């Protein structure tokens, strides 16, 4: 039951995949392919140098554990994972397979004000996957239009959840990479939690409604100023919670500003959209609406269905606090590769 693999050069590299996968074409490097066993269009990712350091070995493991866990319509999961290796000692490459969606939320929306129902449907799907992700005590933490995979039927899957990898230069300047980040994680105010993802959803939703980036900061400080101008400066209760004395000290230097009226910012928008944005874009993370609570909000009355909004089984991330050697991460990775059961 080891399938027959065939070799092929794509993306300056030798892809060796089971015969079931045909018509590979570039799109880790990623190829679109046709899965002859399932009839599905699939995306196949070949990891580069998954075991070159302790840090990458753990990342590879992390990515696989994460992708193996997610079984939800609005979250990218695994149809397949394989390696051409026949044993651990020759194990070297990992290939991950999921549904081909073919575009991201930008390749559809950037500089476009969309209809209220399209916004309803896209945001409902994001919140629906987020409830599922968050129920597993997993934090996406870098949610943004380019991490939302979307096909022609406006069906949406969340990508790249749970990886905490972005370098400082990637976050610097007038860059999309920081514009959807919650202030408390942007400026490292505190050991953050899952409510940071709801901040990102509000940023995305606002942009779908107006056709414009909500907080297009030119640097971290410019972006903070844009945020506080909309949502107000921190009150006393929130200040305490900023465990970062340096951060706290800077915020207290700022002229106090009241929260703006959202109905005058998002002129013409559905009042239920505005109301929901007000519950999403709250400075104090403790008081933000959660994914579960938002799904029950009147804005989504057309799509909401409490019997089809599943939660996840618990996700054992005890491994995150574990120090291991490269080859122990590799062995754990191999185990997960070889224990994989495909879905129905
Ligand atoms: C979002 C997107 C836009 C254009 C082309 C492909 C894709 C795309 C991917 N990059 C990916 C993708 O990056 C990916 C993630 C996990 C995995 F196991 C395998 C994968 F190929 C998945 C699906 N699609 O549709």
Active site residue 160: yes
Find all residues with CB under 8 Å of 194, minimum gap 6, and list them.
134, 137, 138, 139, 290
Alpha helices (H) in 187-254, listed in sequence order: 195-210, 220-231, 236-241, 245-251
C-alpha 31 to ligand 1 mean position (Å): 8
DSSP letter, residue 72: B
Q: What is the torsional sign of CA 7, 10, 12, 18?
A: negative
Domain boundaries, the chain: 15-102, 103-311
Paired sense of beta strands 13-18 and 5-10, if any: antiparallel
Helix-then-strand count for the chain, H and E: 12, 10
Q: Do the domains 15-102 and 103-311 sit in the same CATH topology, yes or no? A: no
In this structure, what token pair is assigned to residue 71? 């079984």
Distance CA 95, CA 64 (A): 10
* 77 Cα nearest atom in ligand 1: 18
Distance CA 256, CA 271 (A): 27
Nearest to 16 by CA among 67, 77, 82, 87: 82
Architecture of domain 15-102: 2-Layer Sandwich (3.30)
> What SS3 class is residue 274?
helix
Q: Nearest residue CA, atom 9 of ligand 1?
A: 43
281 and 230 in contact (C-beta within 8 Å)? yes
Distance CA 319, CA 136 (A): 15
In this structure, what token pair is assigned to residue 270? 């559905």
> What SS3 class is residue 239?
helix
Alpha helices (H) in 34-91, listed in sequence order: 54-69
93, 160, 222, 327: the catalytic one is: 160
C-alpha 30 to ligand 1 mean position (Å): 7
- CATH code: domain 103-311 is 1.10.510.10
Distance CA 284, CA 184 (A): 9
C-alpha 27 to ligand 1 mean position (Å): 8
User: How many Cβ atoms are within 10 Å of 176's Cβ, its own excluded?
Assistant: 13
Ligand 1 probe mutation, 31, 159, 336, 337, most atoms within 8 A of CB: 159
In this structure, what token pair is assigned to residue 82? 């394989």
Alpha helices (H) in 47-115, listed in sequence order: 54-69, 106-109
* 107 Cα nearest atom in ligand 1: 3
Q: Is the CB of 45 under 6 A from ligand 1?
A: yes
Partner residues linked to 98 by β-bridges? 43
109 and 145 in contact (C-beta within 8 Å)? yes
Distance CA 260, CA 80 (A): 48
C-alpha 229 to ligand 1 mean position (Å): 36
DSSP letter, residue 15: E
Q: Is the CB of 100 under 6 A from ligand 1?
A: yes
Helix, strand, coil percentages in the chain from 3-state DSSP, rounded to 5:
40, 15, 45
Residues in the chain, overall count = 344
Question: Backbone breaks in the chain (C–N > 2.5 Å) follow which residues?
Answer: 27
* CA dist list (Å): 197 to 32, 80, 133, 157, 169: 29, 28, 10, 15, 22
- Please give the resolution of this entry in Å, rounded to 1 decimal: 2.2
Distance CA 88, CA 47 (A): 17
Indicate the helix (H) or strand (E) that contains 286.
none
Q: Nearest residue CA, atom 18 of ligand 1?
A: 96
> What SS3 class is residue 68?
helix
Half-sphere exposure of 48 (CA within 13 A, CB side): 6
In this structure, what token pair is assigned to residue 181? 């980040």
Q: To 5 degrees, how large is the angle CA 34–CA 30–CA 203?
A: 110
Q: What is the torsional sign of CA 207, 211, 215, 218?
A: positive
Q: Is the CB of 56 under 6 A from ligand 1?
A: no
* 101 Cα nearest atom in ligand 1: 25
Binding residues, by number, are 27-30, 45
């Amino acid at each position: 039951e080891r399938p027959t693999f065939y070799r092929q050069e794509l993306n300056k590299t030798i892809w060796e995949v089971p015969e079931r996968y045909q018509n590979l074409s570039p799109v880790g490097s990623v190829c679109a392919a046709f899965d002859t066993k399932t009839g599905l269009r699939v995306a196949v990712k070949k990891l580069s140098r998954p075991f070159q350091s302790i840090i990458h070995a753990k990342r590879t493991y992390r990515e696989l554990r994460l992708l193996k866990h997610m079984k939800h319509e609005n979250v990218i999961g695994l149809l397949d994972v394989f390696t051409p290796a026949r044993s651990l000692e020759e194990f070297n490459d990992v290939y991950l397979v999921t549904h081909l969606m073919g575009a991201d939320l930008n390749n559809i929306v950037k500089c476009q004000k969309l209809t209220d129902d399209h916004v309803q449907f896209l945001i409902y799907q994001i919140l629906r996957g987020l409830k599922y992700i968050h129920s597993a005590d997993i934090i996406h933490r870098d949610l943004k239009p380019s991490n939302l995979a979307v096909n022609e039927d406006c069906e949406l899957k969340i990508l790249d959840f749970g990886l905490a990898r972005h370098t400082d230069d990637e976050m610097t300047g007038y860059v999309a990479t920081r514009w959807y980040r919650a202030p408390e994680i942007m400026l490292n105010w505190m050991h953050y939690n899952q409510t940071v993802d709801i901040w990102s959803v509000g940023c995305i939703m606002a942009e779908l409604l107006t056709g414009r980036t909500l907080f297009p900061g030119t640097d971290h400080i410019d972006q903070l100023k844009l945020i506080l101008r909309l949502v107000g400066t921190p009150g006393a209760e929130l200040l305490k919670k900023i465990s970062s004395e340096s951060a706290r000290n800077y915020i207290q230097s700022l002229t106090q500003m009241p929260k703006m009226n959202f109905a005058n910012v998002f002129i013409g928008a559905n009042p239920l959209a505005v109301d929901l944005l007000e519950k999403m874009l709250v400075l104090d993370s403790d008081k933000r609406i959660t994914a579960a609570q938002a799904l029950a909000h009147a804005y989504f009355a057309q799509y909401h269905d409490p019997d089809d909004e599943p939660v996840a089984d618990p996700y054992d991330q005890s491994f995150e606090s574990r120090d291991l050697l490269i080859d122990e991460w590799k062995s754990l990775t191999y185990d997960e590769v070889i224990s994989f059961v495909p879905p129905p």
